[PDB]
Amino acid sequence: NVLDTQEAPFTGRRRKLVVQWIAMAVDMWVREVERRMGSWVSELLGRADQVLTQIADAEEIASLRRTVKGLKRSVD
Amino acid sequence: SSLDNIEMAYARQIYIYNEKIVNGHLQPNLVDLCASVAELDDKSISDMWTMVKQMTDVLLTPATDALKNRSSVEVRMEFVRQALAYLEQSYKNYTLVTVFGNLHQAQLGGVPGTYQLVRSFLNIKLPAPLPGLQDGEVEGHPVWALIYYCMRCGDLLAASQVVNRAQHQLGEFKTWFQEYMNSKDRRLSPATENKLRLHYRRALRNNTDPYKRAVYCIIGRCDVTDNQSEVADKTEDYLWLKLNQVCFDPQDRLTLSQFQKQLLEDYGESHFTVNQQPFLYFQVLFLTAQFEAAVAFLFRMERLRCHAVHVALVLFELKLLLKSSGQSAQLLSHEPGDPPCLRRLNFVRLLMLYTRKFESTDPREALQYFYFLRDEKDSQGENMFLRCVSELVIESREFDMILGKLENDGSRKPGVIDKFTSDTKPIINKVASVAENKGLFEEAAKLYDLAKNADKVLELMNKLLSPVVPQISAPQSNKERLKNMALSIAERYRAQGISANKFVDSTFYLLLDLITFFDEYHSGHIDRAFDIIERLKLVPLNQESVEERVAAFRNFSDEIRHNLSEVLLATMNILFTQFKRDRDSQLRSQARTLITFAGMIPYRTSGDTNARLVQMEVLMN
Amino acid sequence: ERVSDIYARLDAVSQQQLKDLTYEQLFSQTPGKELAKVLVKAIVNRNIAAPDDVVTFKAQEQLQRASEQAHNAPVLRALLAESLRLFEQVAGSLTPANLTTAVEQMISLKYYAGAIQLCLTVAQQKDRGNTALSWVNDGKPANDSRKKAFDERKICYNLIHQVLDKLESDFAGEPELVDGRPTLAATKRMEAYNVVNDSSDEVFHFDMYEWYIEKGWTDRILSIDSPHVITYLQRLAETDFRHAEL
């Protein structure tokens, strides 16, 4: 809900941090399922990737895109 | 064991072929590895593999799609030649055993020249002269008989020698035949081919010499409808007669597609299996490039399942078998977006059937056959080989043998699957996952512990311990059998520095301490048991700690809160006993503490427990 | 975890670094951090025997379990398919040691196509700018720093050679057709070589032309059709007799 509305302070290039949060949260989620969610999470991680390209720390973003696309595989 | 003598020998050969690919060695000839067992059986099977080798021994384009090789006119042409070379050589052996009683008998005296053999073959099969022969004889036999059976045996040179000694009698046939022997692909030039066909059709359409008729339209590939039944009375003689008549790019012409389809569509199994001889039909399909049909067909004969599966594998490891994309289709089918003259084999189902027979008590051999499915997946994405190993372990329950037994000393003796892939983390969880879903926690723990997945091992170990925490640990009980495995998991998890998240892990070592608290309590070692509970700082004993201990209970695993009732009572009964034996004030103070704690904690059987706790404190005073 | 089990299966420099490892070094020195990484890496590639460094472990765990199976098309295929899925998500980060072991394990389980697909993916991810294609198109000037980019693709291409090599080896003597339709050994040959001809990696196809030439497969190379191979030869002709003959 935060990544779509883009109400301040969650605007502009600061949304790079919103994706980092989403990566951490979802990553901790699949790691908590594989230790022991649907289309809408895959819809998000892919939509979260548009944000990283729309923002394109040149190497941080690049490394982060490959962490998102890794989670999209883990859910599908 | 569910494997017959023949099937077992094949399994061993398939283990070799797997051992070679598992150690990266040279890809040996599978067809040779299968014919190695065939010689241990009757020649009915040996002569099959001979056909399989010769029909698959065609120059291919490595790393090319299967459908492409089989659609290419290039390859389709060589199939016809490899078959004709088999029908000719096969017939040549029939001609030997016809003259000599045994192949060995012919060999000791020496195989005679194809010419003298054929001559010594005509003596028997026509002892008296037929009155309808033409063009005289040659060294005591009709010239056309010699030419036919020489061409039938495949020795065109031997046939041309016959022609050279009858130059005057045969007329213009010499210059025509000499061209056929020269031109490749057993075809003449359109101009000369036209000259002879029209001559034959002119006044020789019905000649009293059947051998003359046969040779002419074998050379000219004419009169495709006339099966020359006078000379081609056997089935192989028919196949050979037609494969010498097929053509490639409108009247009086037959092509492989028409012939191959014409045979099985109009004259199906029914026509070729009335004599209850199965290989006859198989040879008809295999020597016409219809490998999928012949494989499915022969796979239904319950006595020849082994052979049909392997001839499928050979075609599969040679990029020649046309697999069916969808796994929901029948065993034999024609894809909707493919030409009607080709068929497809549901290879996945094929192996799945063969395996179910001996997968129950012969797992090792089953895996060897499951490996060929390594390159395929299913609709859900799982690797077919990996899934087949999961299902085979769920059913067979052969964990130590197939997955590798992880002893209680910290060793992992590898299993049979370790040979095929080194990434054994998923299936061990797959097998552990279902057994977990079937309430088989004690097994799911051993399995999860085999894959060093402590998050799940300790989780399940928490569930198996909480019920047994206050119970009496007695020889061979369910407590001993679970406590002793938990301790064997505590050592191996400390010596190897392994641990799950602190929530799962903290509870696991906490229960182990409590299990010690009751094992000491039930033994009468009151002093020793009191000391343990004091360390855990789980139950307050001085009024100052009540506030913090009460807050901790809120976030402690319910596997602990469950056993709070028995802990308070044992601890109370401990102080209770020590009282009957200043110190009195100290026990009295601690007695109070337990009550106030229990009063502020909502827990299991708080009613009966809180009452008993208060009574035991009153008797102290 | 099982400690000495790791130790026994270590190097000597790894075994001797752990021997004289102090807590100070672990806490505040690089060699200590490096060894910690080595050790965790070992226990991860054994239960398989940062969402990038986490996924890579699970992938090794999936692949390790696959090899521990009795061969269940459903379970084996699932584990393999997933292992590949995961590895590809972290393709750009894979080290030559992890890639090699993975490919080898997949090769042992007859997962040829899959192995090849991983190698190509890894090659494309370690160089999305195609610095390698331009470095080859520029004659490979020494002292240039695209060599690294080309080397990281060559390690993937070599591993692809091993896959195809082991494929023809594993299926040496196996027939391409049985009873009419194709065998399973044949379909894996087609599925593998499909992945090959389905690629758009150009440095890869150059490396494969060179490879075909090496192995002597005039069979397949003369049958490509494409000009791409002609144009490639037109540059390398005045240079080698064997190429000029092609």
The closest of B501, B470, B466, B471 to B486, measured between CA atoms, is B466
User: Cis bond leading into B426, ω under 30°?
Assistant: no
Stretch (H or E) spanning C177: strand C177-178
In this complex, is the C-beta atom of B141 within 8 Å of any C-beta atom belonging to chain A? no
C182: tokens are: 């194709």
Whole-Å CA distances, C7 to B266, C14, C17: 71, 8, 11
3-state secondary structure of B325: coil
Alpha-carbon distance B76 to B58, whole Å? Answer: 10
- The rounded Cα B493 to chain-centroid distance in angstroms is 38
Sequence positions preceding breaks in chain C, C–N over 2.5 Å: 49
Q: What's the full length of chain A, in residues?
A: 76
B540: tokens are: 């307050």
3-state secondary structure of B469: coil
Residue of chain B minimizing CA distance to C115? B375
The closest of C67, C150, C164, C153 to C116, measured between CA atoms, is C164
* Number of CB atoms found within 10 A of residue B573's CB: 15
Residue of chain B minimizing CA distance to C173? B29
Q: What is the dihedral of CA B371, B377, B378, B384, to 10 degrees?
A: 20
Stretch (H or E) spanning B549: helix B546-553
B14: tokens are: 């398939």
Alpha-carbon distance C216 to B425, whole Å? Answer: 40
Q: Measure B453 CA to nearest chain A CA, in Å.
A: 8
Could you tell me which residues come within 8 angstroms of residue B532 by beta carbon, excluding any fewer than 6 positions away? B513, B516, B517, B520
3-state secondary structure of C181: strand
Alpha-carbon distance C162 to C106, whole Å? Answer: 12
- Residue C110 has, within 13 A of its CA and on its CB side, a CA count of 35
Q: Measure C49 CA to nearest chain A CA, in Å.
A: 17
DSSP codes joined into one string, C101-170: HHHHHHHHTT-HHHHHHHHHHHHHHS-SS-HHHHHHTTT--TT-SSHHHHHHHHHHHHHHHHHHHHHHHH
Q: In chain A, what residues touch C86 (CB-CB under 8 Å)?
A: 70, 73-74
Alpha-carbon distance B249 to B243, whole Å? Answer: 15
Phi/psi for B404 (5° steps) reads 95, 120
Alpha-carbon distance B596 to B600, whole Å? Answer: 6
Could you tell me which residues come within 8 angstroms of residue C50 by beta carbon, excluding any fewer than 6 positions away? A67
Phi/psi for A74 (5° steps) reads -65, -25
The closest of C113, A76, C183 to B312, measured between CA atoms, is C183
Chain A residues 2-21 within an 8 A CB cutoff of chain C: none
In this complex, is the C-beta atom of A66 within 8 Å of any C-beta atom belonging to chain B? no
Which chains reach chain B with 3 or more Cβ–Cβ distances below 8 angstroms? A, C
B577: tokens are: 């006993």
By Cβ distance, the residue of A34, A67, A72 closest to C58 is: A34
* Number of CB atoms found within 10 A of residue B110's CB: 7
SS3 per-residue string spanning B85-120: HHHHHHHHHHHHHHHCCCHHHHHHHCCCCHHHHHHH
| Secondary structure letter of residue B377 according to DSSP | B
The closest of B401, B377, B356, B360 to C73, measured between CA atoms, is B377
Q: What's the full length of chain C, in residues?
A: 246
Q: How buried is residue B547: exposed, middle or buried, by Cβ count under 10 Å (0-12/13-18/19+)? A: exposed
Alpha-carbon distance C52 to A63, whole Å? Answer: 9
Residue type (1 letter), B306: C
Alpha-carbon distance B147 to B520, whole Å? Answer: 104
| Secondary structure letter of residue B403 according to DSSP | I
Could you tell me which residues come within 8 angstroms of residue B272 by beta carbon, excluding any fewer than 6 positions away? B235, B280, B281, B284
By Cβ distance, the residue of C46, C111, C223 closest to B374 is: C111
Which chains reach chain C with 3 or more Cβ–Cβ distances below 8 angstroms? A, B
Q: Dihedral sign for Cα B150, B151, B155, B158, please.
A: positive
B543: tokens are: 């009024």
3-state secondary structure of C182: strand
Residue type (1 letter), B341: C
| Secondary structure letter of residue B57 according to DSSP | -
Alpha-carbon distance B40 to A22, whole Å? Answer: 66
Q: Cβ of C89 and A74 within 8 Å?
A: yes
Stretch (H or E) spanning B298: helix B291-300
DSSP codes joined into one string, B330-372: -SEE--TTS-TT--EE-HHHHHHHHHHHHTTT-HHHHHHHHGG
The closest of B358, B286, B247, B240 to B51, measured between CA atoms, is B286
Q: What is the CA radius of gyration of chain B?
A: 41
Chain C residues 166-205 within an 8 A CB cutoff of chain A: none
SS3 per-residue string spanning B135-160: CCEECCEEHHHHHHHHHHHCCHHHHH
How is chain B split among helix, strand and coil, in percent rounded to 5?
65, 5, 30
Alpha-carbon distance B585 to B592, whole Å? Answer: 11
By Cβ distance, the residue of C69, C106, C188 closest to B417 is: C69
Q: Measure B458 CA to nearest chain C CA, in Å.
A: 13
Q: How buried is residue A31: exposed, middle or buried, by Cβ count under 10 Å (0-12/13-18/19+)? A: middle
Q: What is the dihedral of CA C79, C96, C189, B414, to 10 degrees?
A: -50
Q: Cβ of B373 and C171 within 8 Å?
A: no
In this complex, is the C-beta atom of C173 within 8 Å of any C-beta atom belonging to chain B? yes
Stretch (H or E) spanning B255: strand B254-255
| Secondary structure letter of residue B418 according to DSSP | G
Residue type (1 letter), B415: G
Token pair 């690294």: residue: C148
* Number of CB atoms found within 10 A of residue B257's CB: 16
| Secondary structure letter of residue B416 according to DSSP | G
Strands B246-247 and B254-255: parallel
End-to-end CA distance of chain A: 21
Residue type (1 letter), B38: A
Sequence positions preceding breaks in chain B, C–N over 2.5 Å: 249, 581
Whole-Å CA distances, B27 to B31, B399, B608, C194: 12, 31, 75, 20
| Secondary structure letter of residue B419 according to DSSP | G
Residue type (1 letter), B222: C
Residue of chain A minimizing CA distance to C62? A34
Residue of chain C minimizing CA distance to A29? C51
Alpha-carbon distance B192 to B199, whole Å? Answer: 11
B121: tokens are: 């073959």
Stretch (H or E) spanning C72: strand C72-72
Q: Where are the beta strands (DSSP E) in B398-475?
A: none
The closest of C84, C111, C241 to C184, measured between CA atoms, is C111
Phi/psi for B340 (5° steps) reads -70, -20
3-state secondary structure of B133: coil
Where would I find the H helices in chain C?
3-8, 13-19, 23-28, 30-47, 51-67, 73-89, 96-108, 112-125, 131-136, 147-170, 184-197, 202-215, 218-221, 228-236, 241-245
Please list the residues that pair with B141 across neighbouring strands.
B138
End-to-end CA distance of chain C: 59
3-state secondary structure of B423: coil
3-state secondary structure of B41: coil
In this complex, is the C-beta atom of C55 within 8 Å of any C-beta atom belonging to chain A? yes
Q: In chain A, what residues touch C52 (CB-CB under 8 Å)?
A: 63, 66-67, 70
Q: Dihedral sign for Cα C19, C22, C23, C24, please.
A: negative
Phi/psi for C53 (5° steps) reads -80, -20
B429: tokens are: 């969880």
Alpha-carbon distance B510 to B488, whole Å? Answer: 16
Q: Measure A70 CA to nearest chain B CA, in Å.
A: 16
3-state secondary structure of B500: coil
* Number of CB atoms found within 10 A of residue C20's CB: 7
Q: Dihedral sign for Cα B419, B421, B427, B428, please.
A: positive
Q: Dihedral sign for Cα C72, C76, C81, C82, please.
A: positive
Whole-Å CA distances, C52 to A23, C37, C63, C116, C173: 11, 14, 17, 21, 42
Q: Dihedral sign for Cα C137, C140, C144, C147, please.
A: positive
Asked if A39 and C63 touch (Cβ cutoff 8 Å), the reply is no
Q: Cβ of C51 and A69 within 8 Å?
A: no
The closest of C166, C182, C54 to B293, measured between CA atoms, is C182
3-state secondary structure of B172: coil
* Number of CB atoms found within 10 A of residue B527's CB: 10
The closest of A1, A10, A22, A35 to A72, measured between CA atoms, is A22
Asked if B388 and C71 touch (Cβ cutoff 8 Å), the reply is yes
Alpha-carbon distance B444 to B318, whole Å? Answer: 41
Q: In chain B, what residues touch A36 (CB-CB under 8 Å)?
A: 455-456, 459
Longest dimension (CA), chain A: 37
Could you tell me which residues come within 8 angstroms of residue A12 by beta carbon, excluding any fewer than 6 positions away? none
Q: In chain C, what residues touch A61 (CB-CB under 8 Å)?
A: none
By Cβ distance, the residue of B345, B421, B496 closest to C5 is: B496
Could you tell me which residues come within 8 angstroms of residue C18 by beta carbon, excluding any fewer than 6 positions away? C7, C10, C35, C39
End-to-end CA distance of chain B: 75
Strands C181-182 and C177-178: antiparallel
| Secondary structure letter of residue B555 according to DSSP | T
Alpha-carbon distance A67 to C168, whole Å? Answer: 37
Could you tell me which residues come within 8 angstroms of residue B480 by beta carbon, excluding any fewer than 6 positions away? B473, B474
Residue of chain C minimizing CA distance to B58? C176
Q: Measure A7 CA to nearest chain B CA, in Å.
A: 36
Buried-exposed string B46-59: b where 16+ CB fall within 10 A, e elsewhere = ebbbbbbbbbbbbe
Residue type (1 letter), B393: V
Q: Cβ of C52 and A67 within 8 Å?
A: yes
3-state secondary structure of B319: coil
B164: tokens are: 């050279």
* Number of CB atoms found within 10 A of residue B367's CB: 28
Nearest-5° Cα angle at B454, B450 to B455: 130
Alpha-carbon distance C20 to B265, whole Å? Answer: 80
| Secondary structure letter of residue B232 according to DSSP | -
- The rounded Cα B333 to chain-centroid distance in angstroms is 20
A67: tokens are: 């962490």
Stretch (H or E) spanning B48: helix B43-56
Alpha-carbon distance B582 to B591, whole Å? Answer: 14
DSSP codes joined into one string, B559-591: HHHTTHHHHHHHHHHHHHHHHH--HHHHHHHHH
Q: Residue B293: left if φ>0, alpha if ψ -120 to 50, beta else—which one?
A: alpha
Residue of chain A minimizing CA distance to C92? A66
Q: Cβ of A73 and C92 within 8 Å?
A: no
DSSP codes joined into one string, A32-74: HHHH---HHHHHHHHHHHHHHHHH--HHHHHHHHHHHHHHHHH
Chain A residues 19-38 within an 8 A CB cutoff of chain B: 35-36
Q: Residue B268: left if φ>0, alpha if ψ -120 to 50, beta else—which one?
A: beta
Residue type (1 letter), C181: R
Asked if C42 and C1 touch (Cβ cutoff 8 Å), the reply is no
The closest of C124, A1, C86 to A48, measured between CA atoms, is A1
**Given resolution (angstroms):** 23.0
Asked if B392 and C72 touch (Cβ cutoff 8 Å), the reply is yes
Please list the residues that pair with B137 across neighbouring strands.
B142
Q: How buried is residue A4: exposed, middle or buried, by Cβ count under 10 Å (0-12/13-18/19+)? A: exposed
* Number of CB atoms found within 10 A of residue B122's CB: 18
Asked how this structure was determined, the answer is cryo-EM
Residue type (1 letter), B601: I
Please list the residues that pair with B377 across neighbouring strands.
B383
DSSP codes joined into one string, B173-194: HHHHHHHHHHSGGG---HHHHH
The closest of B5, B11, B82, B98 to B50, measured between CA atoms, is B82
Whole-Å CA distances, C156 to B271, C162, C229: 55, 10, 21
B507: tokens are: 């509870």
| Secondary structure letter of residue B288 according to DSSP | T
